[PDB]
Amino acid sequence: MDVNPTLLFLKVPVQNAISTTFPYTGDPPYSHGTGTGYTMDTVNRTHKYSEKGKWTTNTETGAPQLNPIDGPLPEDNEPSGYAQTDCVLEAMAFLEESHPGIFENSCLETMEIVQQTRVDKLTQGRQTYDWTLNRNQPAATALANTIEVFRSNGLTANESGRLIDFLKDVMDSMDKEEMEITTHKKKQRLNKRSYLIRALTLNTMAIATPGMQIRGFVYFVEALARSICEKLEQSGLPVGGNEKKAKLANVVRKMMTNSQDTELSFTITGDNTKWNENQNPRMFLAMITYITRNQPEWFRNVLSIAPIMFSNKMARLGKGYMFESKSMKLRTQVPAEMLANIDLKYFNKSTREKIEKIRPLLIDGTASLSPGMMMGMFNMLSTVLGVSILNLGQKKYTKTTYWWDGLQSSDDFALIVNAPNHEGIQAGVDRFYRTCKLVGINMSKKKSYINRTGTFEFTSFFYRYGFVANFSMELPSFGVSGINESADMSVGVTVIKNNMINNDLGPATAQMALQLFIKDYRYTYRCHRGDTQIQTRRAFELGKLWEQTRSKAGLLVSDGGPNLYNIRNLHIPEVCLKWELMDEDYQGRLCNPMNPFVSEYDAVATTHSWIPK
Amino acid sequence: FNKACELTDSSWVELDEIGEDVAPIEHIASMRRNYFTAEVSHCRATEYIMK
Amino acid sequence: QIIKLLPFAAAPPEQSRMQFSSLTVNVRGSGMRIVVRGNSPVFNYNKATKRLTVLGKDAGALMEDPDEGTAGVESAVLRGFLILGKEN
Amino acid sequence: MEMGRRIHLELRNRTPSDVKELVLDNSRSNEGKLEGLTDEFEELEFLSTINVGLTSIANLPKLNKLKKLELSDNRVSGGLEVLAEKCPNLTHLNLSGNKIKDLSTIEPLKKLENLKSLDLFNCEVTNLNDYRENVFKLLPQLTYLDGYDRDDKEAPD
């Protein structure tokens, strides 16, 4: 009598109606999760999980460092960052044994790209921290400023245009005692410690964005990790949709069908939330050194620079804080540079406690965070570690009646464990839990569940009895990209086609997307169909065209003609789709090369393609 | 929510045209889309959307 | 009017009070509208040439039958009402 | 004022058999029960009780000529079989602002086959989803709900 959509599941199995539980399917308008207190809590938790790790004082940045590796083994189920180097190396060795040569081929096939990439490759990317201006900036302008400053400071080897040359230039600049920054004329002298702390910065508006001196090394290490993952089957990256869908079915078939009827199989789905706390750059450096065994030393240095630099990473602290006095109706803002020495009476209990915890780390308005990682820079290496842990589960390594396998993608994991009895299943799951704890892999027991094999999910790819329900992508914008008629039409139709091909977009939904596309395009460009009664200035001349043409379907949609696109015919260019139907006189007028208007996407060079003023 | 799920008496959303359907899958897609649209085009939710 | 409005009567009618000023026909998803009175894009009639155009595609030619009122009144536009031509 | 005095005033020193419309507005009733009205009223055709403080219509006499009954802005709740049998010739009814829980209590009104219009407003029943269509199903004889028909058209007199 009163609506209750959840009750739909009372007859429909949940896996079918999973889209019911995705409230947004878009980008919300609030942007909750960025600021300063979040950084405070992140640093505090990172250093808390390493509570018993050894403390030391850095010699270059002059900031404390925490090393939890090889620390005491955890005694409780709470998260532990005590990852043992020997266990990690043994796991990597076992992975190599099961997949001989993998690291060798990865290294030798990546050396070329290490020696081939150009400087401009760094231009592509997300926002970057500009040490020159001390604020997040576009990658291209940051690169221009960096080359300008280095040229001023007499470091012009990067002029060769090779990425490795620029990395050597960065090394030389970092070795220099001090440098000059000229802003427009204001000159700033950054000493060795100042420049070093700036270069190891992690700005926070991939939540964290490193500086520019660390881009190339991160790129190289991620390239090696991707190359290693490619040969790995359990790795969930960098495959697309269809292959990811097939991975789940293949794993289930391998684990279940081969097993005897007597044997019992179970599957656990688990989420590794807050996955960067317990993984340290030092363990990554260890695995990197292991990977490049018996390899040229220059390549080893280039590849190991990244985790070495990250282990001394400095984390910036938001923009600051905002205080308000209701009594006097006043508002003020304080920066993070003054948060080191300031009263704690303004803040509340939790905020003042966090400030108390993080006070002894703020160096020059930038906390020091050696342990733990930051989101979205070394994801592939984490996937490599996960697949190694999984590979350690074969029947030969386990040396037990039970066994297990599964998939890991560094954000979600699924594990199928089978054994002759229920006690066998319990033993298998417990042993996997402990083994993954030893390496520092943390399984959240409050967001994981176990059930008989057949039904589970992984990276939102919900799986039920051989059926996958990929929901890992959001719907893009079906609007006017704002270049020109033909350009916008082509890019948008290609966008919808591509989303149909891979992102698993239903046909009917694609049809409504095309409908809304046509609506928005006509509204924006004021090119409405001649038959429609809508009125505008452009409709006058447009109307004339509708009368002149002998074939309505020949006219381009931008010219007021009908939209003949559909699921079957989406890849064809709009101009080419109406080539024959277009009247000969219209064809000649439209594509006249001598037009005065003209002095990626697939489109024809018609007169409708102009550059906006 | 109850009143947001009731059936209104106006055409709140107007959508433009597309090409013809030749493939049987295109026929299925058009059938599904048309059925759903005829169902929801008179719902208050569309009124809220347009407002 | 007879040719324009005849096909809509096929269904098993039911009593109603609405006075439809236009009826909707679904073409290619988008729903076109045909007006009960006057010309519509779906149904156009040119009396100067006496030609019927349906969505721009010719449908034939109309010849007036041995019944007609050429002095105003038109009783098949408004339900329950008789239109008496020009306004006063 | 009270019920009986109001009825006497409306009667206008006339017998309780020649009244075709009775207006009892802003009156009061003791114990929230109808008082005063008796069987003598047999010509009444348009009744109206607003803000009368009646808990339920449990003492309504047999006004067989009662056609336009109004119980608005009141707190009437309970069984409606009394209205079904005592006045089986109701045509226009108004319960706007009343206290009614759900359709299980409005079901008895289906007995009156002459109810051409039933009005509800600011009630609990109207909160239910598809209230209009569900009530129409429960009362097929009804033709104009809340002054509107099954196709949302205003109901001229």
Compact description:
This is part of a larger assembly, with chains A (613 residues), B (51 residues), C (88 residues) and D (157 residues). By secondary structure, chain B is an all-alpha fold.
Largest interface, Cβ cutoff 8 Å: A-B, 22 and 21 residues
How large is the radius of gyration of chain D?
15 Å
The proportion of strand residues of chain A reads 5-15%
Radius of gyration of chain A: 29 Å
SS element count, helices of chain D: 4
The CA-CA distance between the termini of chain D, in Å, is 33 Å
User: What share of residues are in beta strands of chain D?
Assistant: 5-15%
Major β-sheet strand ordering of chain A: 8-7-10-13
Distance between the termini of chain A: 59 Å
Total of DSSP H or I helical runs spanning 4+ residues of chain A: 19
What characteristic shape of chain A results from the CA principal axes?
globular
Largest sheet features of chain D:
6 strands, parallel
Q: Name the helicity range of chain D.
A: 10-25%
Strand order of the largest sheet of chain D: 1-2-3-4-5-6
Number of distinct beta strands of chain A: 19
The quaternary organization reads as: part of a larger assembly
Q: Helix/strand-derived class of chain A?
A: alpha+beta
**Run of helices and strands of chain D:** HEEEHEHEHE
